[PDB]
């Protein structure tokens, strides 16, 4: 069966773009990771940065 996309149809009938960011159940080594933060540099001080 085919579609029916016309301006007459209101909200709920316009196509929606969907992307699924699924992942393997943590069995293989991690190859994708999120962004990492950063910190300025301090010289000769009892700082743990």
């Amino acid at each position: 069966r085919s579609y029916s996309f016309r301006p007459t149809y209101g909200v709920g009938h316009q196509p929606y773009r969907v992307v699924v960011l699924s992942f393997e159940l943590l069995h293989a080594p991690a190859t994708v990771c999120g962004p990492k933060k950063s910190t300025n540099l301090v010289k000769n001080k009892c700082v743990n940065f």
Partner: antibody
Amino acid sequence: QVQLVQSGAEVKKPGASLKVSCRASGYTFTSHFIHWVRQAPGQGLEWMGIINPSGGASYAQNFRDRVTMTTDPSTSTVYMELGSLRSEDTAVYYCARAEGSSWLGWFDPWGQGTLVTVSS
Amino acid sequence: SVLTQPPSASGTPGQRVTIPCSGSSSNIGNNYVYWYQQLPGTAPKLLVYGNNQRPSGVPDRFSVSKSGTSASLAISGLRSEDEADYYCAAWDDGLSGSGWVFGGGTKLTVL
């Protein structure tokens, strides 16, 4: 001249049909979409139908299944047929046009408007 | 009739004229606002589009601002010829149908 000409609604009889011809001049027909506007006395603007220069069409939600409306890219003219008249027809109708991309577009052409009055 | 517009506006002479156009976030917050000036007995004409670009030949006496989900039109130095009709145009999504629903109409009276 760049103008959209539409014939006004004349007097008729119950059980008949009203034919309105909208013609575009001064520019190519396959360059702007065709749009319907309604304005009642002492009221704002309402829109009924859409006819693309070349493609499908969008009818009127309220006036569906009883209005004949199509397109013909030969004489750059369109014909609208109305049946089952009612007192709600008393308004002014604009057979206007819009941009060639819809949505965010400029309504450069305007029509003179047809005064439709139905009474008993 | 979801949109609300004042029936009329009144004020003392010599005061700036402020007209608020407030709706929802779908037509103003998420979409551009079109500002039309309509003459009595004449078809509406687009004057302000996009809130960023303006047609040439339009004096800057009128001012328009957008705050939150609302907009305000401010006119300084009101004159007797400023009595006209003003329309807000935006794309709205309705339960019956989604489209370009315009305003009803504002009428001004000068004594």
